[PDB]
Design an enzyme around this catalytic site. Structure first.
Site, PDB file in Angstrom:
ATOM      1  N   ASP A  35       0.851  -1.201   0.000  1.00  0.00           N
ATOM      2  CA  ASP A  35       0.000   0.000   0.000  1.00  0.00           C
ATOM      3  C   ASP A  35       0.884   1.246   0.000  1.00  0.00           C
ATOM      4  OD1 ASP A  35      -1.925   1.858   0.246  1.00  0.00           O
ATOM      5  OD2 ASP A  35      -2.466   1.338   2.320  1.00  0.00           O
ATOM      6  N   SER A 199      -0.686  15.719 -11.876  1.00  0.00           N
ATOM      7  CA  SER A 199      -0.936  15.380 -13.275  1.00  0.00           C
ATOM      8  C   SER A 199      -1.183  16.640 -14.098  1.00  0.00           C
ATOM      9  CB  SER A 199      -2.115  14.397 -13.394  1.00  0.00           C
ATOM     10  OG  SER A 199      -2.498  14.179 -14.703  1.00  0.00           O
TER      11      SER A 199
END
Ligand code: NA
Length: 330
Positions: A35, A199
């Site tokens: 994770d 992004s």
């Protein structure tokens, strides 16, 4: 040193991925969920409330000649999905894919929430976010990656998740055979303890690319792609009969649909998520309503590039003094 381990989807939907991990001496092999959005290595154990264990493999510290109680230390964690676990702490030898750390904090669960009990395939979590998020008290502990780092050939790990197929986690090296083209690196903020990046935009299907900054985290422990409501609405508007269902808890679409791809930007590069990756199948067994793999992050307080996005790429988690993320097509 290096390590290399295969990671396997737990079910036919790629809901999560498990990776075998050796703990203790002699080795006890548990299948952990790696994770990148959390920083605790915790396991089902011989201490876990018996009614909360349903088929998991447990770590028994009393059977390990290298286990030592970390006296006074406790842990307690709550995840984004509402699940939780807590317990006490041992140090022990932990190996992943041939890479060994001695003195790793192994957090032994005394209690786990119902979602963990009900998932017989996941024996615990191995956190790979920054050690500033580790929940051990009163002495915070390091991640497996942070403890391994100085021994590694290069201070990196890579995630290469498969679509309906096994993939690989590598430590300490880049496998230049595992991706196509070049790796595009992007800046990371560690301020919230995550692999947080920005992004450069998105496209829906064959549509034009929209240049827009989307801050989010690279999180292997989250199944879906969670993005701002504007971006998600633009995606699902291209699927006839798709709608947001408050009763189901997100966007659903007709199982007869063919889904468009979704592209996200990494600097001037582009990662394309095929449409098929966005199908999470019937909302209930036999339903003709299917659950979408792109969902709104509104109310979660962060955008999450979970497995739907990451499994479209070869992803480099660069833990050098100035951390960075890399993305390549594959
Ligand atoms: Na679900």
């Amino acid at each position: 040193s290096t390590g290399s381990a295969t990671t396997t989807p737990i079910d036919s939907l790629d809901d999560a991925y498990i990776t075998p991990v050796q703990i203790g001496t002699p080795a006890q092999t548990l299948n952990l969920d790696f994770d990148t959005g959390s920083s605790d290595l915790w396991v089902f154990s011989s201490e876990t409330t018996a009614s909360e264990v349903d088929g998991q493999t447990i770590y028994t510290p009393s059977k390990s000649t290298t286990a030592k109680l970390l006296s006074g230390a406790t842990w307690s964690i709550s995840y984004g999905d509402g699940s939780s676990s807590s317990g006490d702490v041992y140090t022990d030898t932990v190996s992943v894919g041939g890479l060994t750390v001695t003195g790793q904090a192994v957090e032994s669960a005394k209690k786990v929430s119902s979602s963990f009990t009900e998932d017989s395939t996941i024996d615990g979590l191995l956190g790979l976010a920054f050690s500033t998020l580790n929940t051990v008290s009163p002495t915070q502990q390091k991640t497996f990656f942070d403890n391994a780092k100085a021994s590694l050939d290069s201070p990196v790990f890579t995630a290469d998740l498969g679509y309906h197929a096994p993939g690989t986690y590598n430590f300490g090296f880049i496998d230049t055979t595992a991706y196509t083209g070049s790796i595009t690196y992007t800046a990371v903020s560690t301020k919230q303890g995550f692999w947080e990046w920005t992004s450069t935009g998105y496209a829906v299907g064959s549509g034009t690319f929209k240049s827009t900054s989307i801050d989010g985290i690279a999180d292997t422990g989250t199944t879906l792609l969670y993005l701002p409501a504007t971006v998600v609405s633009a995606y699902w508007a291209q699927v006839s009969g798709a709608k947001s269902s408050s009763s189901v808890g997100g966007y659903v679409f007709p199982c007869s649909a063919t889904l468009p791809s979704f592209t996200f930007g990494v600097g001037s590069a582009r990662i394309v998520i095929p449409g098929d990756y966005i199908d999470f199948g019937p909302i209930s067994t036999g339903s003709s309503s299917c659950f979408g793999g792109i969902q709104s992050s509104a109310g979660i307080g962060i955008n999450i590039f979970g497995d739907v996005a990451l499994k479209a790429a070869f992803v480099v988690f660069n833990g050098a003094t100035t951390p960075t993320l890399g993305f390549a097509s594959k």
